Design a protein around this ligand. Structure first.
Ligand SMILES: Nc1nc(NC2CC2)cc(N2CCN(C3COC3)CC2)n1
Length: 154
């Protein structure tokens, strides 16, 4: 049994949009935009909703680029994160109560202040390769095990 989450990366030729999480789970780390998928909405509906809630942005089309399953020691529910990419967005990103957005050059991605797993799978994101990932965490900082592979269908 697993819970559905979304993660949206606005990735452009020279820059990627990241948000500084201001509260809740993962506060103090840069990440893409997303959250829990609700009842009554598709996964992509949920990605669009969290994107707009956290940045004010809307998008024409979201592309599926990955899936990452996380296990936390002692926690019965697996986290099933569906990762999406878009290039062109509608609007200018602005700060919300949950996220402070900034553009990062692709050689200045702040991996030190991101979830540790990002260092493993962001390269595949940057190569526009579709991937499946699995990470086993002890707490929030320690990766105990992981698998990562390119796939044909996300
Ligand atoms: N880049 C990245 N890494 C993660 N690592 C696992 C935690 C160890 C999780 C993650 N997402 C799952 C959580 N979700 C939170 C913001 O509200 C829920 C954002 C996207 N995104």
């Amino acid at each position: 049994a697993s819970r559905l989450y979304t993660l949206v990366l606005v990735l452009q030729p020279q820059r990627v949009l990241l948000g500084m999480k201001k509260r809740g789970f993962g506060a103090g780390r840069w990440n893409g935009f997303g959250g829990k998928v609700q009842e009554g909405e598709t996964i992509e509906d949920g990605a669009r909703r969290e994107l707009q809630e956290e940045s004010g942005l809307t998008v024409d089309a979201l592309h599926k680029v990955g899936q990452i399953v996380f296990e936390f020691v002692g926690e019965p529910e697996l986290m099933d994160v569906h990762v999406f990419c878009t290039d062109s967005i509608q609007g200018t990103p602005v700060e919300s109560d949950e996220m402070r957005p900034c553009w990062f050059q692709l050689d200045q991605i702040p991996f030190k202040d991101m979830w540790p797993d990002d260092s493993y799978w962001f390269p595949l994101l940057l190569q526009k390769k579709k991937f499946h990932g699995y990470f086993k965490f002890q707490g929030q900082d320690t990766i105990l095990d992981y698998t990562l592979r390119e796939v044909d269908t996300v």
